[PDB]
Amino acid sequence: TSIGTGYDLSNSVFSPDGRNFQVEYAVKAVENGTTSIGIKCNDGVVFAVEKLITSKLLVPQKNVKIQVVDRHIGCVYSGLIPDGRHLVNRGREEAASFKKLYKTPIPIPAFADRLGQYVQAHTLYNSVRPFGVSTIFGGVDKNGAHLYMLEPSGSYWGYKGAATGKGRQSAKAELEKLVDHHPEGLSAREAVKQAAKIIYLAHEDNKEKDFELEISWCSLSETNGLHKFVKGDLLQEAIDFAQKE
Amino acid sequence: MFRNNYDGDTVTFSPTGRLFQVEYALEAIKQGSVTVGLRSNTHAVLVALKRNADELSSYQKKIIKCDEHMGLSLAGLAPDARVLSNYLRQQCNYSSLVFNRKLAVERAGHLLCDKAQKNTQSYGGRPYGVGLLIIGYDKSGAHLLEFQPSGNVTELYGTAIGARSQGAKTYLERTLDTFIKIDGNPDELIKAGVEAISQSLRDESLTVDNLSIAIVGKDTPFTIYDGEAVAKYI
């Protein structure tokens, strides 16, 4: 059963099949978010998102969609806005605390584990609902580049390429194809162009709406391991490469 | 029908993934009176239509100042408007006193957003049912933030929230290419806001008492006009 009446009206309850349903409904909520992707380069991670420009009133260059948890960790989610940015703030707090204590940037696996523990904690007690956002995050540390994606259930895995949101199936298929064609690892410059291609392919689901796409990437070599947005000539090059499709 | 079984509280998703109890809070804004805000690089303006309980009563305070550089206008629930306005004023005082620093509007928006979010997860509490427009001028330039009870804070050149806000918002979309360029004239900016709000009125046209305006910018600290002071703009 896809609904399981009775056992889904509260959090922290197992259904007869062993599933706890509120987490499943939270996963269903992730389906409604804007399509977002993250690609693990040979030496970095590239993030891209299809930010739908809802209205002309918004000032574009200041209402960002990608968030920096720490100067070396990039984070981007899809799902409920409140839960998403609250999780972003909490992860930023955790990274700042770790930097304050150990005087060094937090390694990505430790940050991912801390966020997984935080999110999973909300699936335990019935007074709180599970987070409704699937969060893609990653960066560069002493061990190289890591890309992660934690679900509303709290589960997370290391990904060579991840996608979340509404336009997720086509994006994930194209990302599987990309990883297949480049088993040796993509260069960050090529990865940005491929991410632009993938996002443009994902937009074909909702062509009727105008859109913009933010691209940000952290690479050990090209950006010294600091997360920066793509602007200027490189963004236009990635566009022109994507416009052929 | 099936919505009725899952909107009991803000701690339960519906099988479609929707969180009804906060969609209701966002719909609560539509009960409140229209308020309009618009921005130019030199000044930012708020325009609010005040409502009175009866002909023998004084009008509601739609516009609140939190500091000499920033203020806000709000629509929705009074009990939540009080809480959020008081919290933001307290935080402005905290920033100005403990840190000797004017609270940046961009920081203030997210600082209020974080408080707004927590109510949408814990049982017993309910989402705030008020949407408010933070307006101010700081070192980075003019600002105008439309805060929604879902915890969404967004930078807008101009916006309108409240009952029949669609007309004012459409007029703002149609004249964004113009009202931004005013850039220095406060009178003309307030006038443009006044046409914007005038599109949202079905009855009870603008009057010296029901209309209220605010402005802030490079040279003007947040100042509120009402009564005879706004007779020239009507």
Binding site: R90, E93, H122, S127, V128 | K118, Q121, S122
Partner: peptide, 10 residues
């Protein structure tokens, strides 16, 4: 819940 976390936040 989150009130407990906020107390331990700093």
């Amino acid at each position: 819940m989150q009130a407990i976390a906020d107390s331990f936040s700093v």
